[PDB]
Amino acid sequence: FVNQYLCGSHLVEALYLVCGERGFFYTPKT
Amino acid sequence: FVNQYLCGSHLVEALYLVCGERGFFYTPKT
Amino acid sequence: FVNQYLCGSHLVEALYLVCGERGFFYTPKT
Amino acid sequence: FVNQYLCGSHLVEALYLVCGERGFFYTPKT
Amino acid sequence: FVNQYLCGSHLVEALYLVCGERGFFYTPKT
Amino acid sequence: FVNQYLCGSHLVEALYLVCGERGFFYTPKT
Amino acid sequence: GIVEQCCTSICSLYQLENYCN
Amino acid sequence: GIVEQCCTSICSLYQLENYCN
Amino acid sequence: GIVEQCCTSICSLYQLENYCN
Amino acid sequence: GIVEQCCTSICSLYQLENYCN
Amino acid sequence: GIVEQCCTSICSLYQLENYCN
Amino acid sequence: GIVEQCCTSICSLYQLENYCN
Ligand SMILES: [Cl-]
Ligand SMILES: [Cl-]
Ligand SMILES: [Zn+2]
Ligand SMILES: [Zn+2]
């Protein structure tokens, strides 16, 4: 059940290209 | 600069692995 | 040579995110 | 789950490596 | 199986970052 | 070193793809 | 969260824009 | 299509090369 | 070429969108 | 192996440090 | 920032962790 | 080694195959 773990590494790199200089925040569940 | 931008893309994937469940805020220019 | 090659690697991932359902043609020398 | 979508971003890096100078076409339809 | 195939490629990027100077060995067939 | 350290990250992904079931060893310097 | 909303279905750029500072 | 041929069963390097320009 | 235009200076997404189908 | 162990559950960095020669 | 510290020299997993939340 | 052959000039897939086990 490593599916979501592998998906979050792709989220972080899509977030990086979308937001840019703006930066982003990555909070898995807190 | 493309060079620093590409380094940042590798920096966020390293933060993903190290920080885990805590997550992170990504800030490019302090 | 290698830094334009490394940059193309990231370019193809950004095209995949932006073009979604449309797809794309990737040609370096054209 | 987004399994096909995640597979696709892996296919695009593999094609970049394989195809080199020629380039490739990526079209997800259907 | 593609699922274990994509998982491995995330494992080798994780080994690269954690092993550092020491390097690693990737023998899938165990 | 940075530019070489980033290139190493791409090298290990190209190896996983090229080598398949044989596996590989990554020893930046032994 | 981001994982439950975007790993279950494909978020668009707009919905990903929600997480930029 | 490429998704149909390579996302359930692994495509070898030679099958991937059919999608080159 | 996209390489000449974007490996030099950072191309935004909407500039990269001109290369889609 | 590492696949059967780290692809069925999330290996931590301490668990991965074990495959470093 | 994180850029100045780690794209100018290799940061270890231990100094990357300072940037964790 | 691999770093100074392949990070200085681009190695083709055939050259990369020299480091497989
Ligand atoms: Cl890079
Ligand atoms: Cl994946
Ligand atoms: Zn890179
Ligand atoms: Zn993946």
Curated annotation (Swiss-Prot), chains G, H, I, J, K, L:
Q: List the disulfide bonds.
A: C6-C11
Superkingdom as given in the UniProt entry: Eukaryota
In its UniProt entry, what is this protein called? Insulin A chain
**Organism of this sequence:** Homo sapiens
